[PDB]
Design a protein around this ligand. Structure first.
Ligand SMILES: NC(=O)C1=CN([C@@H]2O[C@H](COP(=O)(O)OP(=O)(O)OC[C@H]3O[C@@H](n4cnc5c(N)ncnc54)[C@H](OP(=O)(O)O)[C@@H]3O)[C@@H](O)[C@H]2O)C=CC1
Ligand SMILES: NC(=O)C1=CN([C@@H]2O[C@H](COP(=O)(O)OP(=O)(O)OC[C@H]3O[C@@H](n4cnc5c(N)ncnc54)[C@H](OP(=O)(O)O)[C@@H]3O)[C@@H](O)[C@H]2O)C=CC1
Ligand SMILES: NC(=O)C1=CN([C@@H]2O[C@H](COP(=O)(O)OP(=O)(O)OC[C@H]3O[C@@H](n4cnc5c(N)ncnc54)[C@H](OP(=O)(O)O)[C@@H]3O)[C@@H](O)[C@H]2O)C=CC1
Ligand SMILES: NC(=O)C1=CN([C@@H]2O[C@H](COP(=O)(O)OP(=O)(O)OC[C@H]3O[C@@H](n4cnc5c(N)ncnc54)[C@H](OP(=O)(O)O)[C@@H]3O)[C@@H](O)[C@H]2O)C=CC1
Ligand SMILES: COc1ccc2[nH]c(NC(=N)N)nc2c1
Ligand SMILES: COc1ccc2[nH]c(NC(=N)N)nc2c1
Ligand SMILES: COc1ccc2[nH]c(NC(=N)N)nc2c1
Ligand SMILES: COc1ccc2[nH]c(NC(=N)N)nc2c1
Lengths: 250, 248, 249, 250
């Protein structure tokens, strides 16, 4: 049988590109989404038209709360219910917005969303994936610029740094079970939908390799490498895919 | 007149050593405590005997919750109330225990991520908002990249605190607030740990085959708050006797 | 037309596996070697049997000296003379032995350990870029550089320098479309003459499978980095270490 | 007796400030210099006027060559000759200039000067210091920007990375002899004499903490800390003194 992967926040953008590339490589995919129901079903429809019964959707809020563990448990369970196995987990879903230190969500909600989606949910999903258990691995979407952060993004930066810690800790602890745990760290890839072209070009111009953002496919390419048999001895590694951005001084 | 400092978890061990050394350097101090009221008070008593009305205590739980923001505001306020100013914040309080991948999990999150990361962030917010040699010092961990087996939440918390150190250094630099870290390796070992396990750790340390005293940790804190560190921000000083250099 | 690659120290072990895998991927290869002439030629003959006129050998000492720059220029030149192009440079050759702080002279130890691990890569990179679809350099780094073996300071210095080169060259060559990356093994092929009981001490420390990487596993990461799947990746170093570097003392 | 320190490249700028501050703390000082004979002798005069017989000069080229080991041995020997002990070594001397990868000194000379001064001479001095052996320690002047380097400075950057490696390897190997080895990593401090004012101001404006370069004295302060009794458990550590510069993205 074909292996199966869960990709979180897979309805659009980088998460879709990953689910699509995994699907093209022969994986069955759970397309997790939160709010983007139309886009999720649309993608699953496309993949199922390509090979029937190879894609399902799974809705869940990944904000931290007392029920986040159950929701993460259910995402993994969805993969086993659909396909009878779960070989790969990609932790892609992420909230991203400013939380200035010197200052209409409460700070408690910001913490829940930015730390929950970027770090706590990846942890609980990792726990569930491991407990529910060939080439098993987890790939965490990290951030190449965590050490040179955008001004006023403390909470998002904290969550991405915690995700590096999870990557290392989980690679260590799960290696005995043959589960590898690695990261992919974009620099600038698909810019935010809300960002104007002028601001987008300011970022593009900073990138040494080509003065352009990574395509979603270029990010997926690295994920596909880490899940592949060509990475069978790689665990605890985070591959930057940033066209040299993180090497550029102020 | 004299500058004032808040030290979280200051009743015992490393945070006590930090409080005492700050006091000895001429700071007035807020000794924050959670469960260790008796100890916090005994320390305040010792400090006030040295110099009258230069040490107060402040109780707060730093577990993440709907009230954590209010608690953190209160800790900072208690500094301004007692002393009229708040020059230094030392984020020392910390929970530490295993959370195997294979207390409810969400309590473990609230404690491990709340004490180690979220409370530092909220205290930092309150400290900056209420604003000279202003600085914040976060107690990190030199072994974050070579973590203890089954300690993922703790490690996540400590990595998040590195993130906070950097992001806050960047954002607060315009206000003249410096933000730095001190990363112990093995210092005062956990009360719970057996004596044989303790010696196993001591033996691994290149520099002298022993743990750091609490005062050795406090020494690095004192440097970072001093006028000798006025251009230093976003730096984390390991104080680990070379432990993190030692391969498997 | 087929692309071409130079692999330094390609006669044996990891560099051999890299040359083979590049050849399998459709590259013509320059097999650089220092002392291992018989192994290099054997490899070239094997490759040429697979596909005629796709492999040459090139002898050179990579120890630091006033002739090192000329040597390095000649290695790159040999690829252009054999194949008309040079698409990929793999800085694999490396000396590795203890240099305690407290029977070669120290200046020899410096020339060999810094020359092979750092200076020769720099000179090869300069010659590669000066001579210029999908150009890239891959440097063989070391996952354990921040947790070094006792009494290996010169080796460790050389490998950290190579990190610096990887970063500095990625930045500087990115406008020419040349990517520069690294692959950092932890423990891979150990000396054949090292006792199994000592090899097992290292094997036991690796989380992922309690074994060293094969040379082929290291080569797989090189192949990824030179591939079209890594078109946006520059300045990156991929650890291929089975989680060894994550293990505390 | 008073402890003694060697400071390489101590005639001017940051090395001079370290020598002065060590002297102020109680140390006897060897002022190593290469070309700056007048400024070296002038500094030694000033310190000796303050406390007689507490400063000597020592001339040496730190370019790599087959005789660099003997010159390094000579620098340490000169400390023992003057003061009968050598407690502290400060590796401060450094060449710094561009070495572009793509097109009056030969490349052989560039390597010898940039790798010799920044790395090989530190190693040889460390070896001589250790071989001749209270509170013993070495401090290497590193560079906070080594992961976000200046364009076309590959050989310099390679040398400074090697110096980080040396700091770690020697901290490990010398810990059993009670010798601690640490680094101080400036961002922008005293800017190059040859740099125009507009370019100096460009650099200043990048620094978050104050929009200005470090004083030599601020760099020296961290050196003083690391050699002091307040750093007795610190080895293998590199303290950035960069005003946040390395945190700033492109
Ligand atoms: N884009 C870039 O330039 C960079 C990206 N990255 C990382 O790469 C990954 C992909 O980036 P990108 O595609 O731009 O990500 P997006 O900003 O597009 O977010 C991906 C998905 O995350 C989901 N998500 C957000 N909040 C929640 C929540 N509370 N619960 C559940 N799901 C949620 C959303 O699903 P839905 O729409 O269904 O609600 C969204 O579609 C992320 O981890 C990101 O941090 C890192 C650096 C740069
Ligand atoms: N000891 C070591 O070897 C090492 C220490 N460190 C770091 O150094 C710092 C000091 O370490 P150490 O002195 O051993 O720490 P402790 O484990 O002794 O914790 C310090 C204090 O934190 C307070 N604390 C714990 N949980 C909470 C909570 N939920 N709310 C409020 N306060 C709480 C407690 O105060 P109370 O007693 O009042 O309840 C406790 O006394 C920590 O940040 C630690 O992670 C890092 C690496 C090694
Ligand atoms: N093996 C491992 O576990 C690890 C390897 N690495 C790195 O991976 C790479 C490959 O490793 P491995 O296969 O073990 O390497 P080897 O020890 O087999 O070295 C590769 C080749 O380097 C060449 N070389 C040595 N000295 C010189 C010199 N002075 N001039 C020219 N060439 C010279 C030799 O060529 P010849 O035989 O022709 O004389 C040798 O065959 C190296 O860069 C190494 O540091 C990193 C970490 C661990
Ligand atoms: N200034 C800054 O902004 C920064 C400095 N640093 C580091 O801090 C340290 C001090 O910086 P700075 O004061 O600017 O250094 P300088 O550029 O002023 O160099 C210090 C001294 O090094 C000596 N030196 C140079 N070449 C040789 C050689 N071949 N042999 C022997 N000595 C030599 C010179 O001695 P003489 O005059 O006697 O010939 C020179 O005065 C250096 O390691 C530097 O890389 C790091 C980052 C930023
Ligand atoms: C400004 O370009 C960026 C840099 C980092 C980012 N991280 C994310 N994460 C996300 N969840 N969208 N988007 C980014 C966009
Ligand atoms: C095993 O020695 C350690 C290693 C890391 C630690 N972190 C903490 N933190 C704490 N809050 N006690 N204690 C430690 C004790
Ligand atoms: C522990 O075994 C090792 C670790 C690192 C190494 N680096 C190298 N380099 C080399 N040129 N062989 N060999 C090694 C062997
Ligand atoms: C451009 O400002 C800098 C940044 C790094 C430097 N390193 C040095 N080193 C030196 N030997 N002068 N000078 C520098 C000047």
């Amino acid at each position: 049988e074909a292996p199966a992967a869960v990709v979180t926040g897979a309805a659009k953008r980088i998460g879709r590109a990953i689910a699509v590339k995994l699907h093209q490589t022969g994986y069955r995919v759970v397309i997790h989404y939160h709010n983007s129901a139309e886009a999720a079903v649309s993608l699953a429809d496309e993949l199922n038209k390509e090979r029937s019964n190879t894609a399902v959707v799974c809705q869940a809020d990944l904000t931290n709360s007392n029920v986040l563990p159950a929701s993460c448990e259910e995402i993994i369970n969805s993969c086993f219910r659909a396909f009878g196995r779960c070989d790969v987990l990609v932790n892609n879903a992420s909230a991203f917005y400013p939380t200035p230190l010197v200052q209409g969500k409460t700070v408690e909600t910001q913490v829940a969303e930015l730390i929950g989606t970027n770090a706590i949910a990846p942890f609980l999903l990792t726990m569930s994936f491991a407990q529910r258990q060939s080439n098993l691995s987890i790939v965490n979407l990290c951030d190449a610029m965590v050490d040179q952060p955008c001004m006023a993004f403390s909470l998002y930066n904290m969550g991405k740094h915690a995700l590096v810690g999870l990557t290392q800790s989980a690679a260590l602890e799960l290696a005995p079970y043959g589960i590898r745990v690695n990261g992919v760290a974009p620099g600038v890839s698909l810019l935010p939908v809300a960002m104007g072209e002028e601001e987008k070009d300011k970022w593009r111009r900073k990138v040494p390799l080509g003065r352009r953002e990574a395509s979603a496919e270029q990010i997926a390419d690295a994920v596909i490498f880490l899940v592949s048999g060509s990475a069978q001895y790689i665990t605890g590694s985070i591959i930057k895919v940033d066209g040299g951005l993180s090497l550029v001084h102020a």
